[PDB]
Nucleic acid binder design. Structure first.
Lengths: 247, 230, 101, 121
RNA sequence: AAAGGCCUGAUUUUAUGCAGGCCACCAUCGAAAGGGAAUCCGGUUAAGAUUCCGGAACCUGGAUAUGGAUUCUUCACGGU
RNA sequence: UCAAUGAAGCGGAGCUGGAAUUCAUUUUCCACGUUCUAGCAUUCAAGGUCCCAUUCGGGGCUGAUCCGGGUUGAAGACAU
């Protein structure tokens, strides 16, 4: 049997992200002395529509406190973020829309987005459009913080980690459908070499584990163990419970 | 003066660009410097075995003074002074026919570890010094008990530079006087007795005592805080 | 002739003192380059018996080599041939890690 | 006791004196004689019909020259060879592996006077 | 990664010094349609021409001197 | 081991203001120049101070607390 399509995808031969128009590494400004004690005050000069990311980029300008230059950096635009809006960030940053705050200082029950898993990663949570984390716990004694995560997860996070106040813009980015093939064609052209995804059943049996047969049927079980190995775990993977949700 | 004006520059958080304070703590030291540095740090963090840290328990500077002083008296004779020494030796032996004793008995510090060791198990060494930072330390770790077990007065000394310059070489990692004249004998006996006060009496405890474990500034201060409140 | 004494401490390898020294160089050796001219031998006793005489013209290098075995040079371990030689792990190197160095 | 004050967290390579070469012997042991002289760059003018046509009405000469014949080289070469000031030198590579040089003479020096003294026209 | 290339003063080949010192950057190649310093016309050969001839242009780099400017209020002036 | 950084301010010990009953003594106690605005912040900083002989220039110290020279963080004998 030849190599399944998904097995080829890991090679990165052709499915590398089409990064020609990607505005840059959309991430948060590094933690520095200014934020670690007080705060800093930047400006959103103007906002551009990033390629292949529903969230617009709140591209900000920060003054370098060490060498006289404007350390350019990009933010992920929250709701209510506008050009000519000063941005305050740091442990002493007053909490407000579009302001980066360390998660220790934010009070309980607050909407946050673009959160650092651990301090230094420059933010890795809820970056997608219309997604936001909820601060549902505070654990100051062990420098921990309990969040409600967009995937319904309950993470514990170092209280030093930081995220930008507000919900990532582009809420409802997925409400209306693509509505046509070319629409999704344009959606994916800019970001992935992953579309179309062609059903494995229609494959000749060599091409896909599920393929082949006089009748266009899957044949064996769709569910496939986590313990299965590359080339076998294609289809339904580790399906804890198939069928309709809430039942 | 109405032209000299005081405008204090606010270097506070978020204010004008900070002045260039000394960043010596933050130098990207070349990797050889780093790997060289923490080697000493690991040399002290870990529980040091008993026969290690028998070094770094050494002589005082004041006692080392007359130590290096009397050795400077007993400096060996470099080959340059041998050139004329062999010149007069060859002449005196040849025509003066003065056997081979035309020169007096040489009185120099015996050096070189195999040479000094040979002086040790022969108990013919009257005093031995050991450099305390030989790389690898394995070269000398056996010497202290070797010296102690047969009663030759040894002394660990800091800095192979002093040994090298007292032997006209670069490093020696060891030194030994086997012959001392009578006038210098009294000073030597004073030194040997006071060195025996340092190592010879206490070697048994050093034979049993451990070492190392020196916590760094962050660790030791923090464990004091836990010690302080608990 | 301290080299004889150095030899018999070197035999007792896992001994506590050399266990300490071993624990020193393991850290020191990784950070330095894989190949680097050793300034001077770390075992003078063995140095002078393996051929090294501390005169001009001799140099010493210190090298590190991966432990473990030599895996098959075939993609995805797809051995082609009779099943006698399917195995692509537990395939041992004919030289020792010495000769590799 | 006393420690210095540095300004850069980055430790660049410390500048250090450099010594230029002091060879015991010359590498080639002798300066090679001129690889390209006057006679070496110029081979022979071409008297094809067109060059015969072109010379008098163009106030220009045609020069078979080496592949290495550079305009800077040839300009001084012909100037020093025929003791004639040159206005400008035009060149090309003839498809038979021969670099042809259309050399042009200034107002005072007229090609025929330079041409006839050579021996041809 | 210990990756220096320009700074400039010693007196117009001038220290290869802190000295009016600096990103902390990281080799190079990859487009005969991508971007690009500057040309056109007329004539002219058996075949070449925005390339040859003639004429008129422009640019780059270099050294470089006159006019004009400005300046005793030291490095311009008109206009809301 | 992981991550980051132009490895920039880490830890400790402080100073200032605060509410506390050792009253202030780190026997407490928290913060150590910015939150109406698409401005600017760059010359070993100005000042103040000391020294030189200072020519018509320079050089040290506070300004800008000091000690530790572990870049910081996580984790940790797990994991790899």
């Amino acid at each position: 049997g030849r190599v399944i399509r998904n097995q080829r995808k890991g090679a990165g031969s052709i499915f590398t992200s089409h990064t020609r128009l990607r505005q840059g590494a959309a991430k948060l400004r590094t933690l520095d002395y200014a934020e670690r004690h007080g705060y800093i005050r930047g400006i959103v000069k103007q906002i551009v529509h990033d390629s292949g990311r529903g969230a617009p980029l709140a591209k900000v300008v920060f003054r370098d406190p060490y060498k006289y230059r404007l350390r350019e950096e990009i933010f992920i635009a929250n709701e209510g973020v506008h050009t000519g809006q000063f941005i305050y960030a740091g442990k002493k940053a007053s909490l407000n829309v579009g302001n980066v705050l360390p998660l220790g200082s934010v009070p309980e029950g607050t909407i946050v987005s673009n959160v650092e898993e651990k301090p230094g990663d420059r933010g890795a949570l809820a970056r997608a459009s219309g997604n936001y984390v909820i601060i549902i716990g505070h654990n100051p004694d062990e420098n921990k913080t309990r969040v409600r995560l967009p995937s319904g997860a309950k993470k514990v996070i170092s209280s030093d980690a930081r995220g930008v106040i507000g919900v990532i813009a582009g809420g409802g980015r997925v409400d209306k459908p693509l509505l046509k093939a070319g629409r999704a064609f344009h959606k994916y052209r800019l970001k992935r070499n992953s579309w179309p995804k062609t059903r494995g059943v229609a494959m000749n049996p060599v091409d896909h584990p599920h393929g082949g047969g006089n009748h266009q049927h899957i044949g064996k079980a769709s569910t496939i163990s986590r313990g299965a190995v590359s080339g076998q775990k294609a289809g339904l993977i580790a399906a804890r419970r198939t069928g309709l949700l809430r039942g | 003066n109405p032209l000299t004006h005081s405008t204090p520059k606010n270097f506070g958080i978020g204010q004008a660009v900070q002045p260039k304070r000394n960043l010596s703590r933050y130098v990207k030291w070349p990797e050889y410097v780093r790997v060289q540095r923490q080697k000493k740090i690991l040399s002290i963090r870990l529980k040091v075995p008993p026969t290690i840290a028998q070094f770094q328990y050494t002589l005082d500077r004041n006692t080392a003074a007359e130590t290096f002083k009397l050795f400077n008296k007993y400096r060996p004779e470099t080959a340059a002074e041998k050139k004329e020494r062999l010149t007069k030796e060859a002449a005196a032996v040849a025509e003066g026919k003065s056997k081979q004793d035309a020169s007096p008995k040489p009185y120099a510090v015996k050096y070189g570890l195999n040479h000094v060791v040979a002086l040790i198990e022969n108990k013919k060494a009257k005093l031995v010094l050991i450099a305390n930072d030989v790389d690898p330390i394995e070269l000398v770790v056996f010497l202290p008990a070797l010296c102690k077990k047969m009663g030759v007065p040894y002394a660990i000394v800091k800095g192979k530079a002093r040994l090298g310059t007292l032997v006209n070489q670069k490093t020696s990692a060891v030194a030994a006087l086997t012959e001392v004249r009578a006038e210098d004998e009294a000073a030597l006996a004073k030194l040997v007795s006071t060195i025996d006060a340092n190592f010879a009496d206490k070697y048994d405890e050093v034979k049993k005592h451990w070492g190392g474990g020196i916590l760094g500034n962050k660790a030791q201060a923090k464990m004091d805080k836990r010690a302080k409140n608990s | 002739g301290a080299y004889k004494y150095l030899e018999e401490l070197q035999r007792k390898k896992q001994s506590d003192v050399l266990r300490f020294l071993q624990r020193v160089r393991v850290w020191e050796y990784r950070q330095k380059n894989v190949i680097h001219r050793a300034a001077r031998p770390t075992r003078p006793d063995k140095a002078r018996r393996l051929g090294y005489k501390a005169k001009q013209g001799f140099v010493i290098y210190r090298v590190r080599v991966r432990r473990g075995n030599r895996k098959r040079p075939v993609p995805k371990g797809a051995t082609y041939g009779k099943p006698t030689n399917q195995g692509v792990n537990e395939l041992k190197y004919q030289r020792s890690l010495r000769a590799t160095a | 006791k006393a420690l210095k004050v540095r300004t850069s967290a980055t430790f660049r390579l410390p500048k250090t004196l450099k010594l230029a070469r002091a060879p015991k012997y010359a590498s080639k042991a002798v300066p090679h004689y001129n690889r390209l002289d006057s006679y070496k760059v110029i081979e022979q003018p071409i008297t094809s019909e067109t060059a015969m046509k072109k010379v008098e009405d163009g106030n220009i000469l045609v020069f078979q020259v080496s592949m290495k014949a550079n305009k800077y080289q040839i300009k001084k070469a012909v100037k020093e060879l025929y003791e004639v000031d040159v206005l400008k030198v035009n060149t090309l590579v003839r498809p038979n592996g021969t670099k042809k040089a259309y050399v042009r003479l200034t107002a005072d020096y007229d090609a025929l006077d330079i041409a006839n003294r050579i021996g041809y026209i």
